[PDB]
Design a binder for these strands. Structure first.
Ligand SMILES: [Mn+2]
Ligand SMILES: [Mn+2]
Ligand SMILES: [Mn+2]
Lengths: 154, 153
DNA sequence: TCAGACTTGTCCAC
DNA sequence: TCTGACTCCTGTGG
DNA sequence: GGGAGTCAGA
DNA sequence: ACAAGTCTGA
């Protein structure tokens, strides 16, 4: 568990609140238990001209990746454990995306017990909904009701 | 000279590098000596839904204003004296717009000596070009060569 | 099976 | 003369 | 985000 | 920014 410098977390919080994104997703997973996979993603977006800035993040955070998609690049962290460690420390400084961060931390911690009953799983799916609500969601498909419909059919 | 909290400057520098903007503009003006005035602007942009975040920023910086147009609000500061004081403290924490900040500070310090000789004024406008060059400029019209053409008369 | 790497799309928030 | 507040718009980088 | 403009006041 | 996806390994 890496400890991060405070002045680093303070700057990063502002940048994340500006050009970053905290994402919770319910992904279709046929080869699975409830046909639905959960995905948590911390993401920092920036133009490829400044890919170096996002490259620095990989070294400073210690994990994550940088991929290209047009004229724009993104930093990408989805690995649950370093994600929980990173968001735990960044959260006290976030202003605009603090609640999304907290819901993600809360989803991660309740993740193993959500693999049990579908009821507990669907409850966690509703927490995914709230994150999308707090973001500027525009192109969302799979929600908690998309899970319930497939689950009640079973 | 209101001095700002270091933790506040660190967070703000991050938000400025992300959603902020440091703008140097060469505006035309017939009443003015060289037919062109200069304007420096610190700008933080956010949708009106989160205008409150910009409202806090005004109270925190003490100076500035929030303007609305469409679905987006904006904090702005163009008052030279408070802007110079503010950018001075904010500069060391900037990472993506640090060069823009320093150039603006450079322009401001060479401002009273720019209203003198045309050759000096052209040099200051060249600094404005660099700022637009460092930025993601896409709608710029008046450059230093525009001033050059007008100056030859 | 399943989390994690890596890609593609779109609408707007800058 | 001259500055700064204020509005509106484009074209992306988120 | 990063300009273009117009205006009232100083 | 906020999604939507594919596919490979253990
Ligand atoms: Mn933003
Ligand atoms: Mn940005
Ligand atoms: Mn942004």
């Amino acid at each position: 568990n890496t400890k991060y410098n405070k002045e680093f977390l303070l700057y990063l919080a502002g940048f994340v609140d500006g050009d970053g994104s905290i994402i919770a997703q319910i992904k279709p997973n046929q080869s699975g238990k409830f046909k639905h996979k959960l995905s948590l993603t911390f993401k920092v977006t920036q133009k490829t001209q400044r890919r170096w800035f996002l490259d620095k993040l990989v070294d400073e955070i210690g994990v994550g990746y940088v991929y290209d998609s047009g004229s724009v690049s993104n930093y990408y962290l989805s690995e649950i454990k370093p994600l929980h460690n990173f968001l735990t420390q960044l959260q006290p400084f976030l202003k605009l995306k603090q609640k999304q961060a907290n819901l993600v931390l809360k989803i991660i911690e309740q993740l193993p017990s959500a693999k049990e009953s579908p009821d507990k799983f669907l409850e966690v799916c509703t927490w995914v909904d709230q994150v999308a609500a707090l973001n500027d969601s525009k192109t969302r498909k799979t929600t908690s009701e998309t899970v319930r419909a497939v689950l009640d059919s079973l």
